[PDB]
Ligand binder design. Structure first.
Ligand SMILES: CCCCCCCCCCCCC/C=C/[C@H](O)[C@H](N)CO
Ligand SMILES: CCCCCCCCCCCCC/C=C/[C@H](O)[C@H](N)CO
Lengths: 59, 64, 278, 252, 238, 238, 278, 59, 60, 59
């Protein structure tokens, strides 16, 4: 019951590793340091009537 | 013979003034004051005072 | 793998399109790409926002308190020691958690236990390997009062035994909270009449740890010092917060000495250096 | 033109002709609690439009040497009619808010305001290891005032503008939902806060949800002859409010 | 009976581990998750938000709100200077304690472009132009207006749109610069110059205030975890 | 020869383990299983069963059967009070040593609704009404009958069906409450009020007895194993 | 995964359906859902009755007895120690087992062995690592009488050797009973004439443990103390039982001092607090 | 000869683990802490002529 | 609980090892590789290049 | 997620081994001592107008 992911590696020049979960609890697992997504659309641009960035956005 | 603190924290750029540099027996709530070691100048964003707390240890003093 | 955004090439422009002139009065951070004001080139960028994520920022084994207790003392209260569990007595991990307002994580806990032989006349002994017991008390349980108390018999409480010379103890603990997340900051009171105690001290309620030597009373005093290392993992955080400027004063409030904004300067413009000579 | 904005809630209406842009929250619009995240079991009271309407707080006068003001909103709306009464008879409550701050001047005036909604603004005491009285934190509809120099009143909040009471740099408070009332071009300090807490419903008196702050960075300054009295009026409307756990009259 | 050879690095305690551990509370029932608005998944969602720069920190204005107010008035001779500082977010005293600087002092390498926003908080009749300029390092600090117009500059006209954005691009030879001060990764200078003047009508105040913001672009990145040089503790807080 | 690195947490003895062990009696023949009636798979099958509440525990009636008998008689003025206690199964003195309280003192969090059954053990000619009321916390304890009729109440008519059920719902802001006493998870009050009176014919005894039960619903749950605060041992039992 | 039951919504009612009026005289617990008396809402409930199950309630490593024995004593009877196996000399695990009447489980057994150097004149030694032997005797076998007896030669008896400094010993034991389940309570006699010994003492019959130091007689006295940790697993239980109110007095009966029902009060009604002032 | 089950995890926001039995006896196995079923119909409602809960259940 | 027998040669430090180690800087972002001209993959690419021989090394 | 390569062996008289990567980083892996390729065409013969070795390569 193993699962294979990719190792973090350099760019411009896909090596795999293995992981097996041994314990019965979800707090026992290793930390998930491979989630790189983001969404800064709720902190920047937190407005109504979404602006255009080419118009003056007033008058 | 009340509870007393230690010698105040020796900084590498600040030394004590001269009512405090000699005398022992620092009680609780006692404030001491530092001066710049002779060749240095003051950073105006930091206040050079140290209060001894209830657990007989001085407050945090870093670089005045 | 989510790379950073690239730079697209541009050229001259003479039009009614004004990316520079914005209104910062609308609570709005402008989104001016560097290809919108100057002429740029095609740069295929390979940078990864990996080690700035919340998991990569918080999942380090920080330190929270030091605990000292002896194995032969005349007073029975220094033969064991306790600590009510908070994360607010060391400023580094406290400030890193106070980047965020609500957090939710599991804790991986490590103890680093060191013993020092104290000073006595009969200092030449032949002592076997010391054994430590680290007992956790959930909030409300019975508390020990001596080293030979029968409250240490750990029938329900999780307790960890360790022999001197091995690897340090390590155990994980799940999300032990009654709310939907932890609270770093709580602006309220304990009693419904808006009296009582103010702040985050109402929401700690974590129980406490107890430490003793499993061995009997030795013939020479040995002090032991145990360091609790919390290490958060499986972390989520909500509603961020400006980082704290002033220095902390206590563990049960946010009270402070007023510090200025930053380090000072001598004048408001810059120029070349006015030091020694050519 | 997009300088005009009308906001209709209940039986009250605010029209502005020199608005700039309405901010709404962290991207989230206020909404009633779903029954997949709910904890309490009895039927909640979503009352009417009787609470979801604009209420006018008192006005503060913005002088040349004024420093700042703050309010505490689940406590500041405690005597505004049926919102205050439904606060006083229920145990749990839950509401978003639409805050509209007014201030006007002429074109010959200058000065800039900062209007932030700060969740969980845990205030610090003036003298360090000392309790804080409830009147110095929240004074109902009456604003408490920051100072310029550090304060040392007993059982009072440490009120310096360069630390904003909490102990951070005041130039870093633009991370919360905010706008600017620039008297050159604004009157639209509109901020639609969703409900932000770590429990799905909470008590109104025991917990303060957030704190409005009006801090003038570029101070009010005018030439001789213009109108010297410039008031600031704060209008607030709860949104999507509901209540649960009815019992006898509460703690006034 | 398995033949097992222990490798070096056994029985140590390393700080940044990713190992598995037994649970002290077995089969514990975790409370259900609630959708709290405003989730942070990256610290770089925070650094892209504007925050005001304490520019006027000259030797007493630190202990007031006047650190954030940059003075501007009508000048009897054009071509003068308004302010200036050194582009080092985390080492320079100006943007040291800013939001970008406080995220950025827990790191040791940075890269990407930086935005700068200038809100004119003056009268509605006042008008004038400024010269917002960035000069890459290698030469000295520019001393005239005609030396600073050779850099990467923008001329900003005060009008109905009361704020401009000076976007400082990424001009380097290395992929990263240090957040601290070393001479190999110097980064340049930001200066502002009166382009014409401030011109006001009668019975309107001359002396007004410019406010400066700072943020990061969508290509900003940080690399090396270190501790901040600002946290200081002497005894335990009790 | 396998490369094995020992992790921290080796060679300890943790109490709530789930490891495997060698058998001291290898290939032992276990006796066959027999179908004994009344199998318990969950402790919550036990807590859902009625058990009598020692309500009348006023300072001497603990050492008799009179702790369970609640007095009721005919009153010369209606609208009075009958009894009352605080809804804390495991902290409050009334339902402390009950079956639900003794299951519930080995835990530290609880949730779900609680039932209350009132058996009228009086004459067959006696009749009257009561006001069984639950008042959520936030205000004080109600002091009139007209303040306690604002809560969650039921009017119970004594007739041929001699028992009623007051079901106390789950009104909270958190998913769990503590079984011990803290101010953040206060839980409310249970009071009972004379609605009219007790009315009896001639040569029938006036003073009768109400018995109170307690149980749990089908949505009741407990979370954190701890030791009970009632077990006490000084030396070994020999 | 078996969730708890949900709450269904309801409305007003005026009918001859009476869920509240029941008869508690029929030995019957009423099943009134909270949606039957008040108007409720739809609550999708996500709670799990996990940590209240009999396995999650009993499978903790509790403690049952402490055993002390020396390595150099003048009397030969304190150089080893024994214990007849029951689970009835510590009140916590005894009360937790006496929730149920008949139980059936396997036992995972752990010993936690600690040695203390006793007081003597020649206290400065250089002692090698101590070695312990823990021997189990089935019911009826031959018993040792000294530390150098040849009855310790463990040819058939399971015995466990341990060296000081390692992990504690642990072994599992299957269902060692002659009946179909264990008996927590036995209301009967030993002899068929209804005489003899009364109670559960007829059904123990478990044999006993024996402990000694494997090493020879040292030059200085060292006492060792071993703690037996039973930990039940694969558990089934039948015909439950009210929990014990009074305190235990012995290990071979249920005899008690009469305690009252609960903690007292001052009056039978409640009201607001009568403490200090406004 | 391994078997894969699910780990106990939180709700409202299926991770697998592995288990291999090494010893020859059934008493050697790990404890079965994942049986959550119940039936309180023999302790509550322990009667004959099963009641309806809407009827008065007498007369 | 796995039966493991330690073989001889445990807990030594041999110089020419080829073992695996934990990383002290987890999830570190390595800078991208650049095509620098003149790559050496073998030292025998160097030894095949001419170099002058100091033949007349007579004593001064 | 294992991979099988060949062991380095003598000549004139294909034995396989196994390797599993355990850690999440690429710097954690064992050293790659099995790349035997070469190209001495940039150090020797580093010229333009490539010579023939049979011609005099001058005049
Ligand atoms: C037998 C070993 C058990 C060791 C027990 C030590 C840790 C148990 C306490 C739970 C840890 C909670 C960590 C702190 C929670 C919150 O983040 C803090 N209040 C700060 O908000
Ligand atoms: C070599 C190591 C062997 C260690 C022997 C120690 C334990 C062996 C005895 C069997 C354990 C039975 C546990 C008790 C059974 C019943 O539950 C009790 N009489 C209480 O009812």
């Amino acid at each position: 019951g193993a699962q294979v992911s990719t190792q973090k590696t350099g760019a411009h020049e896909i090596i795999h590793y293995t992981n097996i979960n041994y314990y019965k609890d979800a707090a026992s697992n290793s930390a998930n340091r491979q989630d790189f997504t983001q969404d800064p659309g709720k902190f920047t641009e937190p407005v109504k009537d979404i602006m255009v960035k080419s118009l003056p956005a007033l008058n | 013979c009340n509870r007393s603190c230690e010698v105040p924290t020796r900084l590498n750029s600040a030394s004590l003034k001269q009512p405090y540099i000699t005398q022992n027996y620092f009680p609780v709530g006692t404030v001491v004051e530092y001066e710049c070691r002779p060749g240095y100048r003051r950073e105006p964003s930091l206040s050079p005072k140290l209060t001894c707390l209830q657990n007989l240890k001085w407050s945090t003093a870093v670089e005045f | 793998v989510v790379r950073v955004a690239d730079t697209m090439p541009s050229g001259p422009s003479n039009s009614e399109s004004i990316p520079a002139l914005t209104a910062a009065e609308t609570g709005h951070t402008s989104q001016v790409v560097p290809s919108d004001t100057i002429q740029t080139r095609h740069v295929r960028n390979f940078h990864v926002r990996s080690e700035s994520s919340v998991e990569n920022f918080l999942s380090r084994s920080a330190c929270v308190y030091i605990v000292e207790y002896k194995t032969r003392d005349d007073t029975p209260d220094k033969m064991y020691d306790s600590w009510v569990i908070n994360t607010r007595q060391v400023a580094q991990l406290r400030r890193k958690l106070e980047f965020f307002t609500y957090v939710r994580f599991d804790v991986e806990v490590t103890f680093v236990i060191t013993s020092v032989q104290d000073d006595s006349t009969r200092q030449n002994t032949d002592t076997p390997a010391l054994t430590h017991q680290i007992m956790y008390v959930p909030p409300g349980g019975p508390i020990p009062q001596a080293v030979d108390d029968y409250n240490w018999q750990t029938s329900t409480n999780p307790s960890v035994f360790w022999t001197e010379g091995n690897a340090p103890p390590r155990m994980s603990i799940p999300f032990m909270s009654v709310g939907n997340a932890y609270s770093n900051f709580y602006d309220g009171w304990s009693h419904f009449s808006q009296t009582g105690v103010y702040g985050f001290n109402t929401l700690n309620n974590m129980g406490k740890l107890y430490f003793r030597h499993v061995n009997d009373k030795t013939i020479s005093p040995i002090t032991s010092k145990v360091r609790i290392y919390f290490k958060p993992k499986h972390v989520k955080a909500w509603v961020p917060r400006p980082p704290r400027l002033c220095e902390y004063t206590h563990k049960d409030n946010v009270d402070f000495e007023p510090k200025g904004v930053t380090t000072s300067r001598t004048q408001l413009t810059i120029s070349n250096s006015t030091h020694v000579e050519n | 033109s997009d300088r005009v904005r009308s906001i209709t809630l209940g039986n009250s209406t605010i029209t502005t002709q020199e608005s700039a842009n309405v901010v709404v929250g962290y991207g989230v619009w206020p909404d009633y609690l779903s029954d997949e995240e709910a904890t309490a079991e009895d039927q909640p009271t979503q009352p009417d439009v009787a609470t979801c309407r604009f209420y006018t707080l008192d006005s503060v006068s913005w002088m040349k040497e004024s420093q700042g003001w703050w309010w505490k909103f689940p406590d500041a709306l405690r005597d505004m009619g049926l919102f205050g009464q439904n606060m006083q008879y229920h145990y749990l409550g839950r509401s978003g808010y639409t805050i509209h701050v007014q201030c006007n001047a002429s074109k010959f005036h200058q000065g800039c305001l900062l209007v932030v909604c700060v969740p969980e603004a845990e205030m610090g005491a003036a003298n360090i290891n000392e309790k804080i009285n409830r009147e110095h934190l929240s004074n109902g509809e009456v604003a408490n005032t920051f100072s310029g120099t550090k304060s040392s009143n007993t059982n009072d909040v440490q009120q310096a503008v360069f630390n904003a009471g909490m102990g951070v740099a005041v130039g870093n408070l633009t991370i919360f939902p905010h706008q600017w009332i620039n008297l050159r071009t604004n009157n639209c300090a509109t901020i639609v806060m969703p409900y932000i807490n770590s429990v799905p419903m909470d008590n109104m008196f025991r917990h303060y949800n957030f704190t409005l702050m009006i801090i003038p960075f570029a101070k009010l300054d005018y030439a001789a002859g213009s109108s010297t009295y410039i008031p600031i009026t704060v209008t607030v409307a709860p949104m999507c409010a509901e209540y649960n756990g009815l019992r006898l009259a509460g703690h006034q | 009976g398995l033949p097992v050879m222990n490798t070096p690095g056994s029985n140590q305690f390393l700080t940044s581990d990713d190992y598995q551990s037994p649970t002290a509370m077995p089969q514990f029932d975790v409370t259900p998750e609630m959708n709290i608005p405003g989730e942070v998944k990256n610290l770089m969602e925070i650094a892209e938000v504007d925050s005001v720069v304490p520019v006027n920190n000259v030797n007493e204005n630190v202990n007031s709100l006047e650190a954030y107010r940059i003075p501007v008035h009508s000048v009897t001779e054009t071509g003068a200077q308004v302010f200036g500082f050194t582009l080092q977010p985390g080492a320079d005293t100006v943007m040291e304690r800013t939001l970008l600087g406080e995220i950025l002092n827990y790191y040791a390498n940075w890269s990407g472009s930086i935005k700068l926003t200038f809100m004119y908080c003056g009268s509605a009749m006042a008008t004038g132009k400024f010269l917002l300029a960035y000069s890459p390092p290698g030469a000295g600090v520019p001393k005239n207006r005609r030396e600073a117009m050779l850099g990467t500059h923008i001329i900003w006209d005060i009008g109905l749109q009361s704020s401009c954005v000076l976007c400082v691009p990424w001009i380097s030879q290395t992929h990263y610069r240090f957040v601290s001060k070393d001479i190999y990764t110097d980064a340049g200078f930001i200066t502002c110059w009166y382009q014409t003047s401030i011109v006001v009508p009668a019975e309107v105040q001359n002396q007004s205030v410019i406010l400066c913001f700072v943020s990061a672009c969508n290509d900003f990145s940080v690399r090396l975890l270190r501790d901040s040089p600002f946290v200081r503790q002497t005894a335990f807080y009790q």
